[PDB]
């Protein structure tokens, strides 16, 4: 976006911001889901004596 001319950046940045947020949002939920599974696996794992 820094190489773009000054008046072409506004419209390009919108697309870039929306595309990056879409992928960032998908990462957050997957991180969460995999964290929840890790903690639920901790609960049912057999303990040590």
């Amino acid at each position: 976006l820094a190489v773009l001319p000054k008046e072409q950046r506004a419209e390009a940045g919108k697309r870039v911001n929306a595309a990056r947020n879409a992928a960032q949002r998908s990462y957050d939920e997957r991180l969460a889901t995999l964290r929840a599974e890790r903690d639920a696996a901790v609960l049912v794992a057999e303990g040590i004596d």
């Binding site: 903690d39 901790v42 609960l43 057999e46 303990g47 040590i48 004596d49």
Partner: protein, 836 residues
């Protein structure tokens, strides 16, 4: 803008001491030791100067400003005496042509080391510099050069002589019980005491009679309950606004940390420094109607004479007139009546405000003025008119005008006429007894009269009436301190007391040492843990909202605004310390702490003030203790990285949960109690590697590996393990064993039992002990096996058994019977199946 301690030049002090004791003179070094000896902390001894060579008075004859540079730059010709002129480039801006200034010419040496040679600057030559008070080591320069008042000296006069540079400035930190020592008056009196000198009090009717009192001056009303003790007013009419203070006055104000402004204000500060009674000057033409002293109303404001608005509260005492606030009483005057350039008629104010009221007000408003810090330590009410008269005469002397023969002197309702505190009765030998020194006969009466008290002597009792400037003298112990400090503490001998036979350390105290020793021997390093929890730690742990650890005592004003909660558990602080050490290169770490925690309850709240003139009753004592949060001693430990370092013997052993269980057993052995460990779920521990620790059937804590999410969210190392026990819930114990050593041989057998995988190994061993009875001398697990021969969710345990009789050799069949009874006990209590 405001200074701090008691500064005064030696010459002034000497002058006042010398009136009574002609020619008294001591070195600064001796004076320092004498002051320390009698109880005045000497923070600094500042010899003025020194200067060498041509540092002389000069007069600015011509100024030429120099444009093109960052600041205004003046090219001045200065008359340096004997009709000679020097060009000098100077930076400052607080002088005009005609001013007497102090020049340091080529060949001079300034404190300290700055050799003055003719230098160039801004395309012009400079035969020296015009000095500031700082550059001369005279005072604080106030970002400007020093102008001497007209007539102070001639151009060419020797600067060191004119400036009195052979003086020495003492900076003392006066203790708050000695308000009378915030002046030359009190300090001179203390020295006359310490040197046994005849003393002339500078605040008495002395050398000139008091001023006449032919009628009332300005009218005054004082609101009841304001704590004003005295309020005197006397005007000086028709002073010369163009007058300035003479050099001797300006210098003394400068040496004492006070910047000189104009004669009316300079005189109030000078007399305040000399006598200890703060004085205020009002422009008399700017007062509207009756002067009133009253409390401030809620939300009221006042503009002090620095142009700053102050939010007032209702405990602040004001001086007002009909139109505006004249002063925040005893703290700072208001702009409305302040003396200024044009003022010709001055109304001088000598008042005594309530010490506590001034203390509250000045500290809340952050105005520790020269007046305020004197009134909060109390001011001698007997000298208000004496200081008033001294002030008025001095001001008429400097600036002209007439001292009016009128005086308003309000001395309370009803008028108080004797300002001495109540008399104190004390045995004549009481100082001797407290000191453990037999003082020469008559020492106590001599010393107490020296400090100004009236002493009457009947039998072996003194009746001692303190002087009005000593309101700190209220009981015999106060008087004892006076005698002892003047005689000097060095005469008191050093004698160890006879202690009765003590009982030494308590059991709890001994046990804390033993636990400490043992953990340190096992590789743990002690930290002393902060009681302020990390921000949101229990959220990072994921604790339930009703977890008791979240019920914390809170600090109103903590070190870190985000850490006001006091710790209910030591683990947060230990874990923070763990991260700290690991972050600095020491990845293999074991830390412990032994410290109290803070656990409030329902009854954790305030208890109102109880009068301190009696013992609190046993019910009040118990209510005070019951109102505090519970504060039990805990012991805790954390470990991460390698538990055992690598070496020639192989690569070393990573920390594991079993190391945390061993730390529990180290603590229990040190405490000489038995513990049992049971599986538990309890954040922040891993629910499958967590033990709850029991003594008897009382829970005392938890141990094991921390939960992986807690580790991830707190930035802790993988595998961190931890222990925390409540020491106060571990009972003391005094085991008295009486072993009997059987001379007969023992029998060794082993036994393999299969149990469900969730049965703890220790519950099997206990069942084996239970069934086997008295022949069983020892049992030790040595094998846990879960291979393919063992069903799923089951495990095979094998124990080494040692049997021995106290009175016979056993047969193999005798042990086998005991083993078979153990096997049956294990089937009955834990479902064990004899391995086949």
């Amino acid at each position: 803008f405001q200074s701090n301690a008691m500064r005064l030049p030696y010459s002034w002090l000497r002058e006042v001491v010398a009136v009574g004791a002609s020619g008294w003179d001591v070195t600064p070094g001796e004076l320092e030791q004498t002051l320390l000896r009698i109880g005045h902390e000497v923070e600094e001894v500042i010899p003025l100067g020194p200067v060498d060579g041509p540092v002389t008075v000069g007069r600015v004859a011509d100024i030429e400003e120099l444009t093109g540079y960052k600041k205004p730059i003046r090219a001045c010709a200065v008359d340096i005496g004997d009709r000679q002129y020097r060009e000098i480039i100077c930076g400052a801006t607080n002088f005009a042509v005609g001013d007497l200034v102090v020049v340091a010419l080529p060949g001079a040496t300034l404190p300290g080391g700055f050799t003055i040679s003719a230098r160039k600057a801004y395309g012009r030559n400079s035969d020296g510099m015009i000095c500031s008070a700082a550059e001369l080591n005279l005072g604080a320069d106030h970002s400007g050069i020093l102008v001497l008042p007209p007539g102070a000296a001639e151009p060419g006069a020797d600067g060191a002589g004119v400036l009195g540079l052979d003086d020495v400035v003492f900076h003392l930190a006066i203790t708050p019980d000695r308000g009378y020592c915030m002046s030359v008056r009190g300090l001179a009196r203390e020295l006359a005491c310490a040197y046994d000198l005849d003393f002339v009090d500078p605040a008495s009717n002395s050398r000139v009679p008091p001023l006449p009192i032919e009628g009332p001056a300005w009218p005054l009303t004082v609101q009841p309950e304001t704590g004003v003790r005295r309020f005197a007013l006397r005007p000086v009419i028709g002073i010369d606004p163009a007058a300035v203070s003479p050099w001797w006055l300006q210098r003394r104000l400068l040496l004492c940390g006070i910047r000189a402004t104009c004669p009316a204000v300079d005189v109030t500060n000078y007399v305040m420094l000399e006598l200890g009674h703060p004085m205020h000057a009002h422009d008399r033409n700017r007062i509207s109607g009756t002067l009133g002293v009253r409390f401030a109303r809620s939300g009221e404001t006042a503009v002090t004479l620095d142009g700053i608005e102050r939010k007032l509260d209702t405990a602040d005492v004001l001086i007002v007139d009909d139109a505006a606030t004249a002063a925040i009483g005893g703290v700072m005057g208001a702009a409305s009546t302040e003396v200024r350039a044009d003022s010709t008629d001055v109304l001088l104010e000598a008042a005594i405000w309530d010490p506590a009221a001034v203390s509250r007000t000045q500290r809340r408003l952050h105005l520790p003025s020269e007046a305020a810090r004197r009134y909060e330590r109390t001011v001698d009410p007997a000298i208000s008119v004496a200081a008033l008269d001294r002030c008025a005469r001095l001001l008429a002397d400097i600036a002209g005008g007439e001292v009016s023969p009128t005086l308003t002197d309000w001395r309370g309702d009803p008028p108080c006429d004797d300002w001495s505190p109540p008399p104190i009765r004390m045995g004549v030998d009481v100082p001797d007894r407290i000191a453990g020194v037999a003082y020469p006969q008559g020492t106590t009466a001599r010393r107490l009269a020296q400090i100004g008290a009236v002493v009457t002597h009947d039998g072996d009792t003194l009746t001692v009436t303190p002087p009005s400037w000593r309101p700190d003298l209220r009981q015999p112990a106060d008087l004892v301190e006076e005698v002892l400090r003047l005689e000097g503490l060095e005469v008191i001998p050093s004698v160890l007391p006879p202690a009765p036979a003590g009982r030494g350390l308590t059991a709890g105290q001994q046990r804390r040492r033993t636990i400490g020793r043992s953990l340190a021997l096992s590789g743990y390093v002690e930290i002393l843990p902060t009681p302020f929890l990390p921000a949101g730690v229990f959220d990072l742990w994921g604790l339930e909202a009703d977890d008791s650890r979240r019920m914390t005592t809170r600090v109103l004003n903590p070190l870190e605004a985000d850490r006001p909660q006091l710790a209910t558990t030591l683990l947060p602080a230990l874990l923070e310390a763990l991260v700290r050490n690991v972050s600095r290169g020491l990845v293999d770490v074991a830390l412990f702490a032994i410290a109290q925690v803070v656990q409030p309850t329902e009854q954790t709240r305030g208890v109102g003030l109880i009068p301190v003139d009696r013992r609190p009753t046993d019910d009040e004592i118990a209510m005070l203790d019951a109102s505090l949060p519970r504060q039990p001693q805990h012991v805790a430990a954390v470990l991460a990285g390698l538990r055992e370092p690598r070496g020639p013997w192989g690569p070393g052993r990573p920390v594991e949960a079993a190391d945390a269980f061993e730390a529990v057993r180290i603590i229990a052995r040190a405490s000489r109690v038995d513990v049992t460990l049971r599986p538990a779920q309890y954040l922040p521990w891993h629910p499958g590697r967590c033990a709850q620790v029991f003594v008897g059937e009382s829970s005392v804590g938890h141990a094991g590996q921390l939960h992986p999410a807690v580790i991830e969210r707190s930035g802790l190392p993988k595998g961190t393990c931890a222990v925390e026990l409540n020491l106060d819930a571990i009972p003391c114990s005094a085991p008295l064993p009486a072993p009997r050593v059987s001379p007969y041989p023992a029998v060794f057998q082993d036994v393999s039992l299969v149990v469900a995988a969730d049965i703890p190994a220790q519950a099997v061993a206990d069942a084996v002990r239970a069934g086997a009875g008295d022949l069983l001398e020892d049992i030790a697990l040595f094998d846990v096996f879960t291979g393919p021969q063992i069903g799923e969710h089951r495990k095979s345990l094998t124990f080494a058994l040692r049997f021995r009789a106290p009175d016979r050799t056993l047969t193999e069949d005798d042990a086998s019977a005991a083993r078979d009874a153990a096997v049956q006990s294990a089937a009955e209590r834990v479902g064990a199946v004899l391995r086949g």
